[PDB]
């Protein structure tokens, strides 16, 4: 599966173009709602991959990121049951919201994103965004870089 | 293999205009953003202007706004620079460079440079 | 702007021997978010354009030899050539990339070797 419980996974987006030392720099509240992330990505991988020519690699990865996040959702329940219930029962959802949750939040995104606009598109403005923080204010234009 | 081939450079007048090409092979052109650095008779390197992978973010120094235009052909896998009111400061080796943040991190600074086109401004 | 100063502006070393060149920005190029330094070396070989040295202040380019060690944090940097060889005979230049709205470079350091 793609996305992991690891702390710094093997390949998450390398494939793709991008790097997590890229996504990092966008902030938390930009990514909406996770059922509404995932309703809209089966929403296009469905139509899609049948009928072709549209076998893209992002809504394909993405049967590998739905599944594995239905391969936590099965998991979860089982952990905070199975052992103890204080920092073993409770620390479950803590674990997965919001430091998992956000790891999903924007893979989601840059795959949804990469097929409404365009790989070089998304890959431009996750290059483009993270120019506009790094720079020192004032120097930097106050108008943030927009993905439309 | 990254090849990046600049043309145009020539002897021109001061208040004259030149356009530079640089043409580019061995990568998806239109994933990478692109500059141009230019090294003056002193040596020092200085950076000239870039354009994102696919033509919508434009930056310049105060140095040279308003009198250069950096512009892209991802159909043609060409880069320009369209210079104009050039003044003898203009002077230099042109090189065409390829930005490395588009490969993966923001790590990645300009990775390859072209050979480079001297501009001669003088009358 | 953040200028980029490099000193010495040159140097003699005999083959086998330790390089130590200096850099340093006006301004602090360490990001505080990332924690990383916005720092890049550069090559410059007679007759050559740049090549890409060291990014981040410390990691060395795909293809660079281990002899190549970059150091320092904040704004002021290094970069160590030990042991050298006549190949490395360059002029090295440093870089800053946190601005990217404008990009400095240092004036160089002119690498010669001492026969």
């Known amino acids: 599966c793609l996305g992991w419980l690891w702390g710094m996974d093997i390949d998450p987006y390398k494939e793709f173009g991008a790097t997590v030392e890229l996504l990092s720099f966008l902030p938390s509240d930009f990514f909406p709602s996770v059922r509404d992330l995932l309703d809209t990505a089966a929403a296009l991988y469905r139509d899609a991959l049948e009928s072709p020519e549209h076998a893209s690699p992002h809504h394909t990865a993405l049967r590998q990121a739905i599944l594995c996040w239905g391969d936590l959702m099965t998991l979860a329940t089982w952990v905070g049951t199975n052992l103890e219930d204080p920092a073993s029962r409770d620390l479950v959802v803590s674990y997965v919201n919001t430091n998992v949750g956000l790891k999903f939040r924007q893979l989601l995104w840059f795959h949804i994103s990469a097929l409404t606009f365009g790989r070089e598109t998304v890959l431009e403005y996750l290059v483009s965004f993270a120019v506009w923080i790094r720079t020192p204010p004032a120097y930097r234009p106050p108008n943030a870089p927009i993905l439309s | 293999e990254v090849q990046l081939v600049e043309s145009g450079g020539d002897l021109v007048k001061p208040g004259g205009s030149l356009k530079l090409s640089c043409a580019a092979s061995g990568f998806t052109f239109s994933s990478y953003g692109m500059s141009w650095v230019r090294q003056t008779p002193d040596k020092r390197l200085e950076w000239v202007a870039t354009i994102s992978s696919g033509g919508n973010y434009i930056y310049y120094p105060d140095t040279v706004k308003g009198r250069f235009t950096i512009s892209r052909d991802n159909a043609k896998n060409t880069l320009y620079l369209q210079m104009s009111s050039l003044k003898s400061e203009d002077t230099a080796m042109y090189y065409c460079?390829?930005?490395?943040?588009?490969?993966?991190?923001?790590?990645?600074?300009?990775?390859?440079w072209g050979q480079g086109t001297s501009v001669t401004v003088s009358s | 702007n953040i200028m980029m100063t490099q000193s010495p502006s040159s140097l003699a070393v005999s083959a086998g021997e330790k390089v130590t060149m200096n850099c340093k920005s006006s301004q602090s190029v360490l990001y505080s978010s990332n924690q990383k330094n916005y720092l890049a070396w550069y090559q410059q070989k007679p007759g050559q354009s740049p090549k890409l040295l060291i990014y981040w202040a410390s990691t060395r380019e795909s293809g660079v030899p281990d002899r190549f060690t970059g150091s320092g944090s904040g704004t002021d940097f290094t970069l160590t050539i030990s042991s050298v060889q006549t190949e490395d005979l360059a002029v090295y230049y440093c870089?800053?990339?946190?601005?990217?709205?404008?990009?400095?470079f240092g004036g160089g350091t002119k690498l010669e070797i001492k026969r």
């Open positions: 870089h800053q990339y946190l601005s990217s709205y404008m990009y400095t």
């Open positions: 460079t390829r930005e490395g943040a588009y490969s993966g991190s923001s790590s990645y600074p300009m990775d390859y």
